[PDB]
């Protein structure tokens, strides 16, 4: 048991085999490799280096099993804690570096400045301690879904001037404060206490139940997530940043700049000012919201929205029972709703309305992930489905006027449908749900575009079916059949065949109107699509 007394500099050496070194003067260049054999969580340990009040340790290396205890008024310079060593800090530590399960506990009254947490190292600031000028490079390599709180920085006290690099993680517990942080892309900070003055230069900030975040700026690639029961105030959403406010979250004094994404629901609280004026999402009522660049507003059941602008890259999602009036969707805006929602506004091509009370819609335009669902007994008129838009019809839906499908458009049919107007398909219609449906239209105009249909080639003469009611089938439209019966079994067709397009009440079809997209064989037969004199089209057997 060496005792370095005051003004007696010890200037190299090691420490082993549960031996203590009591420092009252100066002890440079030590190797502490004893005292922590039993693990950080036991008062059963003997050995290590103990810097007393007024003592100094410079360029110590605490390696596996080594324990360095700095008491009140001691100091530890340029310390390397690695490979499962630890430092218990009640005084001053300057320029510590933590590698591979090296730990630093800064207990009440302790102060650590310049700690670099390098990989699988850990700095725990117990309540009443202070960490200043920390660099965190680890803790967050498992992604936003990693629940790792065992490496990185955990604060129960206070952390000032922290830089969080890729893979770095800061957890602020209930009692904790983190003031002035810069969080780069790949790194994150989890806030359960107080985070104040945070710069997300592509970094992530999670604000959980009972966490307060004040003065966060979200630059490009950054993310502020306010969970239920968390609260953020005075956030600035710069271009290509997003603020996420969950049901039960507080977002007050939000500055949504141009290019800023806002993702929230009427079940949260978001007050602020965007590039068009003031906005409020409060108590189930949103007024003035501007969804762009990945922003989403969900108007849940029995809430309301007015003066919403859905711009290119934004999404308005109105649940059934929600209302949203004076909507303006610019070309490239997405609208998700069904015939039980109530929406009014204007889109890229004029006025539109969904009246959830009667279940009739008129003039929709579904682009870029927009979607509408016509529920049972509903009716959508003059629909325009664009690239990446979807129109789904529940069993018992109706169409009215001209249903136009642009290239890249989807229309899914989950049961029998009647259009009392014109379907114009340049995209893809698809009979899905194993029951077979009938799509009745007055006129079909094919502009390319497959209708994906289903067939049983197993002795049934059973299939999906198109019906031209009184009108005409023109253009060119591809038919894609899938055999849903017993495969490798093919039965012969009987007489005229499986009727797939039925012309009725005087309907005519043109002669190159329909065409098999790919061959249809089952078992020993090739199934061929043939138009006859009755204007109807049939599936028949080959050789
Ligand atoms: Mg701990």
Numbering used by the authors: 2 to 434, 453 to 562
Article, verbatim:
The best-characterised SAAT, antigen 43 (Ag43), is a protein that contributes to cell aggregation and biofilm formation in commensal Escherichia coli K-12 as well as in major pathotypes including enterohemorrhagic E. coli (EHEC) and uropathogenic E. coli (UPEC). Ag43 possesses a modular domain organisation that is common throughout the ATs, which encompasses an N-terminal signal sequence that directs the secretion of the protein across the inner membrane, a passenger (α) domain that is responsible for the function of the protein, and a C-terminal translocator (β) domain that facilitates the translocation of the functional α-domain to the cell surface. After translocation, the Ag43 α-domain (α43) is cleaved but remains attached to the cell via non-covalent interactions. Similar to α43a 13, the α-domain of all three Ag43 variants folds into an L-shaped right-handed three-stranded β-helix, with each turn of the β-spine comprising three β-strands linked by loop regions.
α43_EDL933 crystals belonged to the space group P212121, diffracting to 2.98 Å and contained four molecules per asymmetric unit. The α43_UTI89 and α43_EDL933 structures in this work correspond to the uncleaved α-domains. Present within the structures of α43_UTI89 and α43_EDL933, their AC regions consist of three β-strand rungs capped by a β-hairpin motif. The first superposition predicted an α43_EDL933 functional dimer stabilised by two interfaces, each consisting of 12 hydrogen bonds. Conversely, when the α43_UTI89 functional dimer was used as the scaffold, α43_EDL933 molecules were predicted to self-associate via one interface also encompassing 24 hydrogen bonds. We generated a second mutant where we mutated T199 and T256 to glycine at the base of α43_EDL-933 (Ag43EDL933-mt-double), mapping far from the predicted single interface, and responsible for 10 out of the total predicted 24 hydrogen bonds stabilising the putative Ag43EDL933 double interface dimer. Examination of MS528 strains expressing these mutants in cell-aggregation assays showed that while modification of the predicted Ag43EDL933 single interface did not alter its aggregative function, mutation of two residues in the double interface completely abolished Ag43EDL933 mediated cell aggregation. Hence, we confirmed that α43_EDL933 interacts via an extensive double interface. Although both dimers are possible, the double interface dimer results in a 550 Å2 buried surface area, compared to 260 Å2 for the single interface dimer, suggesting that interactions such as van der Waals contacts are also important for dictating the preference for the double interface dimer.
